[PDB]
Amino acid sequence: PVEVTALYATDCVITSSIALLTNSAEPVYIFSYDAYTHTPTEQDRFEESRALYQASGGLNGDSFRVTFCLLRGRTRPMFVCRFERDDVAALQDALAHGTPLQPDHIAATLDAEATFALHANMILALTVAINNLTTLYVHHEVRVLAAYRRAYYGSAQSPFWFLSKFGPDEKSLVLTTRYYLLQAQRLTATYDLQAIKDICATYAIPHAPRPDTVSATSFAAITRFCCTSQYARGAAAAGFPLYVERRIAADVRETSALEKFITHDRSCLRVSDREFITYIYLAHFECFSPPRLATHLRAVTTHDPNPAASTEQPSPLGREAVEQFFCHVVSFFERKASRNALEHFGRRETLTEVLGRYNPDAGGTVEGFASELLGRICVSLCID
Amino acid sequence: FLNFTSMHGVQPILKRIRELSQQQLDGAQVPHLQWFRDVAALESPAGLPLREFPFAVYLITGNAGSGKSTCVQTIEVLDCVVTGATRIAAQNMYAKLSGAFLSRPINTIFHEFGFRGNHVQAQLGQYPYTASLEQRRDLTYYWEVILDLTKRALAARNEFRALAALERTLGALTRLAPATHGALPAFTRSNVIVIDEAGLLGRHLLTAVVYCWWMINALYHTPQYAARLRPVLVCVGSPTQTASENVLTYLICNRTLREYARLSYSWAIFINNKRCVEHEFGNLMKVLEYGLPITEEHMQFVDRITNPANLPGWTRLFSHKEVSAYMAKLHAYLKVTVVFTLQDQDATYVLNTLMGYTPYVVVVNYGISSKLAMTITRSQGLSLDKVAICFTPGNLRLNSAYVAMSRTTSSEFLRMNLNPLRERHERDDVISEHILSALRDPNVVIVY
Numbered sequence A: 001p002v003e004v005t006a007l008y009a010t011d012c013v014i015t016s017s018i019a020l021l022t023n024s025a026e027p028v029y030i031f032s033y034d035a036y037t038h039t040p041t042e043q044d045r046f047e048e049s050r051a052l053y054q055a056s057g058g059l060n061g062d063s064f065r066v067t068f069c070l071l072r073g074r075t076r077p078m079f080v081c082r083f084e085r086d087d088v089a090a091l092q093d094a095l096a097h098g099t100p101l102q103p104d105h106i107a108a109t110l111d112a113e114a115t116f117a118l119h120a121n122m123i124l125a126l127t128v129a130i131n132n133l134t135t136l137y138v139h140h141e142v143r144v145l146a147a148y149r150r151a152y153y154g155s156a157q158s159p160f161w162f163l164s165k166f167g168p169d170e171k172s173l174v175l176t177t178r179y180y181l182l183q184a185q186r187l188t189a190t191y192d193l194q195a196i197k198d199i200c201a202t203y204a205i206p207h208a209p210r211p212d213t214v215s216a217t218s219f220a221a222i223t224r225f226c227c228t229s230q231y232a233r234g235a236a237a238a239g240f241p242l243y244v245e246r247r248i249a250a251d252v253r254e255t256s257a258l259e260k261f262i263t264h265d266r267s268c269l270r271v272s273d274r275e276f277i278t279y280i281y282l283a284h285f286e287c288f289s290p291p292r293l294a295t296h297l298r299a300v301t302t303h304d305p306n307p308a309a310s311t312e313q314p315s316p317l318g319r320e321a322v323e324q325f326f327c328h329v330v331s332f333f334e335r336k337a338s339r340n341a342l343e344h345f346g347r348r349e350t351l352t353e354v355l356g357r358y359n360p361d362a363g364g365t366v367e368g369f370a371s372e373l374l375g376r377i378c379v380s381l382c383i384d
Numbered sequence B: 001f002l003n004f005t006s007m008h009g010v011q012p013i014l015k016r017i018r019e020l021s022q023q024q025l026d027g028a029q030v031p032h033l034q035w036f037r038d039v040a041a042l043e044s045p046a047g048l049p050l051r052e053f054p055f056a057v058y059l060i061t062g063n064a065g066s067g068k069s070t071c072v073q074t075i076e077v078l079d080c081v082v083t084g085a086t087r088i089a090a091q092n093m094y095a096k097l098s099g100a101f102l103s104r105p106i107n108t109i110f111h112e113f114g115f116r117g118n119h120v121q122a123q124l125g126q127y128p129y130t131a132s133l134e135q136r137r138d139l140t141y142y143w144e145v146i147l148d149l150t151k152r153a154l155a156a157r158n159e160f161r162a163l164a165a166l167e168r169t170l171g172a173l174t175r176l177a178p179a180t181h182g183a184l185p186a187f188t189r190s191n192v193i194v195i196d197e198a199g200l201l202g203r204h205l206l207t208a209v210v211y212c213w214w215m216i217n218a219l220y221h222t223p224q225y226a227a228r229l230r231p232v233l234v235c236v237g238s239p240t241q242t243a244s245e246n247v248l249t250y251l252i253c254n255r256t257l258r259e260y261a262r263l264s265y266s267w268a269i270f271i272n273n274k275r276c277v278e279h280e281f282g283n284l285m286k287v288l289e290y291g292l293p294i295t296e297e298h299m300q301f302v303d304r305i306t307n308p309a310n311l312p313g314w315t316r317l318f319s320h321k322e323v324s325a326y327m328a329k330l331h332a333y334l335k336v337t338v339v340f341t342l343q344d345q346d347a348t349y350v351l352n353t354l355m356g357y358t359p360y361v362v363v364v365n366y367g368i369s370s371k372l373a374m375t376i377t378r379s380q381g382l383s384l385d386k387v388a389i390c391f392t393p394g395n396l397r398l399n400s401a402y403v404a405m406s407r408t409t410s411s412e413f414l415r416m417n418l419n420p421l422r423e424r425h426e427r428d429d430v431i432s433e434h435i436l437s438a439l440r441d442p443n444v445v446i447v448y
Ligand SMILES: Cc1nc(N(C)C(=O)Cc2ccc(-c3ccccn3)cc2)sc1S(N)(=O)=O
Pocket: A278, A281, A282, A285, A286, A336, A337, A338, A340, A341, A344, A345, B063, B064, B271, B272, B273, B274, B276, B282, B283, B285, B286, B287, B289
């Protein structure tokens, strides 16, 4: 038994889903799908996750339990099918080649007990509202439809929404969508979507040219645009969540270690107000500059998904406390701020530099503009 | 992308909020619906009893462009009611947070909180009053609104209690009441209420929001009410750039509200400005705010208009009438000149999109937005790129200067008439002193 969470879609999905439960319906598309076995070293975790997927086989399992879900909680299940028969072939096709699952296969696999177990409370609520199986859709139809609109929020989107929000690249779409909507809740990583997008960008794994270079329309082809992706099956798909954890571990180690120094030195410097603000911004610059952020991001970048390879190397972000955290104890916070802005913002030349350009004190231009009010009566002080 | 390695500084924030709203109150302190009755019966605030409506606050402050909105984006792993203080702010957060992931249509605090039409045209503060959290002065202040709101709410239930009774036969079905009914307010579904740009609100409006939240949660007996769950207002805003007394200022200054809220343990400060790219401008803005001493060195860079002749596509920030005079003369001389000439402004519209006319001028009607001349007070919140200031001396306050100079990305587009750092200028350093002490507090969290 290989459990699976499938985030399907329908060319609204609420109407089709209610109809499908009603035995009264459209083909659905498994956009992103999870796969996990019930019941370990990260080496073992990667090995099991890899062996569950496969380069050839869509999913290495004979029996399957598929919870079909839609969009705290970012996805919510709708109905649980089972696959023991040779209808498993259709599941393999959908999860592997992106072929839509027809309604008939759904009905032949719809495990009524589990599907209606997680609906019963909602039928009760609908009845209670009406009093003030699921087939309340036959009479009092619009109310049931609207209630399920409100229940599975934003489960009726456009393909453009998934394509835009969840990534421009194949890697972003497949891995970020799968992780954020499914594996974050299943498995830590209560992080924003953009955070996981950034973590994905660091997932610098071997890319492969597309056997049929395409991109983008409506809900037919994003499924085939994702299920056939190299990123959805194998070491990459098996190592992405583990690497999300590893990347967060490395970052948080560095960031927290530097917050310790900032926070202590912030609450112990008996210092003038000017030097206090100079210090706070100087510390944040010396810790989290764009150059040092780039260096750390490269240091946490992985090139091979297997955690046994782990091309990522120990970061220098925190060990760069040597440059600034000389705070053992014109003042030093100002001069470091200078030798520093000189670098990152530029050389501000000097007044004598332009006095050389004018070799107006004697050059007739002192009466060149200052004597030229030009009707307005730099100028007007006591106009940036 | 590298600009978001402050997201790691946002996670502790959420922890506190998650810690802060999981906290249940004791039963004897939870407000009871009977309190909200006989408030509807009391004719004048004189008969109000001393009763403590509970709440919690996790405050968010920092200059504009600091990334204070990124926290509201990240509060989408928490169940929350994000709301704004102005329709502009509500739409701004709708766009900001609906560009990242899903987002329900964000309304202003006044669509929540029950504020309606017969509430703007209401004079306030007439009743007198002479600290303890035991709030009464705020409700006395804002009493016409509070009274009308309570009378309307009582005059018009059992949407939630019915499901609770049905479960008492066999607490789950209560949570599905929002899914079933499409009218129950958003205060009924979560105790985390995020207010964007809270400085644009009156110091009395905090107490009013807490009040009406308890009132709805009692009149409906929502499950959070049954859980002894308390309001958690996340007031995101800018204290120094936004202006009576601010909710943010009310929280930062009032000592009993600063100790009931336990702010030092529940406050984040956003120190960065991703907008400005020039160093000297940044140092000036860093001084204006944080109330650092003004130096001749900070002058000589501010050293580095009424005539509509030459700055096209530049907004002249003036107080109230000068805008009218400027715009009037603009229209008056463009007659003899791209544009042509036909209630918040003075009359007559320029064709610069406001170019086309018929009378759906381009739109139903003809109250419109010009973005040509608009006062310093109204300049707050609106971020521009085409600034040109017209300070008048004799009533010059560095709050106004700090506002006016901070609407624009780069100082290359900055013009004005006088030097606000050279003339006589009023120093309001109390907020700056509080913020600067706050930075110097080990328990406060600071995000670069
Ligand atoms: C070389 C350097 N660059 C530094 N940056 C990137 C910044 O200040 C960025 C910034 C700029 C303006 C503000 C602000 C502060 C109050 C009100 C409005 N805006 C905050 C942050 S800090 C240093 S330095 N000389 O301390 O090493």
